[PDB]
Specification:
This protein is mainly alpha-helical. It contains 22 helices and five strands. The chain binds calcium ion (CA) (5 copies). The PDB classes it as peptide binding protein.
Amino acid sequence: FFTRNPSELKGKFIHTKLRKSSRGFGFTVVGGDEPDEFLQIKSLVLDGPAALDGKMETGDVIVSVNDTCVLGHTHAQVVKIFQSIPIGASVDLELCRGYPLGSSAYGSVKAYTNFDAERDALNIETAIKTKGVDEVTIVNILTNRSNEQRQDIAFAYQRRTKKELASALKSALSGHLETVILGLLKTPAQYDASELKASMKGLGTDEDSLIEIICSRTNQELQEINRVYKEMYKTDLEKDIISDTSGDFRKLMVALAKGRRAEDGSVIDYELIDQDARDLYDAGVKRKGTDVPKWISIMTERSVPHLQKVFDRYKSYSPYDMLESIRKEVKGDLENAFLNLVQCIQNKPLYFADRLYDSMKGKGTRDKVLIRIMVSRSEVDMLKIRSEFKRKYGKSLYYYIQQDTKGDYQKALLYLCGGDD
Ligand SMILES: [Ca+2]
Ligand SMILES: [Ca+2]
Ligand SMILES: [Ca+2]
Ligand SMILES: [Ca+2]
Ligand SMILES: [Ca+2]
């Protein structure tokens, strides 16, 4: 939720006055990069003038600065205001509290307010070394901390025990719960890189997992994945994809994994929307056979909001929509890849919702799918996924997880789900 009007903010307004010392006002601001986004306080230098006052907190939306509304200004416009303030001069800030954090706006797992990594690390060490292992404590803590906070905990635990927290939990847990907890301990890039590597172990590859990650990750997420993957496995993710895929499926996976999709433009390009739509039609349903490189080119290179509009304009040319056209035109890993991709373009929360439903709908569970989605999306769009799940399937994601899993494994997934609907 974003608004550039102070009369539509429904939080608490706090007026504060600060003097810029020798090391700035003493705080870090975040947000204000994507068009409709707020500007919230990230951290406070505890020896700086901002933390000194004590009226300013993390998550506060900066409504105005020096009698000028900065609601809806970019990140560089309000940074230039505070930097132009000389040393010793005064700034006036009206803040608004009641809003999450922007980045994790639709996540289910939020940063724990009274976070203390040392206390969490000790409590986790005590749980591990309790006779019989206190899994409930390990679950209650790690699933109610952000990933960032889980990195501080693992650092404090290594500071205290001289052993890595992941090694310790490995020897204390087992089965599906172990998979969940170790997944949560990795950073997003680390987790995705290791799922990618596991989908390529042995001669046979797990095409479904490779497709799920490569089709759903953004440019930014794919950039960091490529970096951490070579760091961890001493090889480029692209090379490993070339090794374990072939044909047109290889072309599509290599192109998507580059994370070089064009960024969402400023202007809507209506002529290109219609021309792209025309080109997708001519390349497939209009003709015998399929010009797959043309599909690959358009669907991996245009921005997501552009492709959403070409898929709607595509319905003007073809009697089948994009999903139906994919099933009619193509087969195999290639068909699956195209279907997962345009679902991700059209409605990504619904994509994950359907993938979650499919993992639980029948006999047993596809736990690798359920676990990976619960872990990887819990700080991204889990609230939207739950909304789409409930709208489409009539019962909550929570309800299905509760039916399909049991034990501490279930409780860990329910915490990642974040409540019922
Ligand atoms: Ca136990
Ligand atoms: Ca083990
Ligand atoms: Ca393989
Ligand atoms: Ca055909
Ligand atoms: Ca089931």
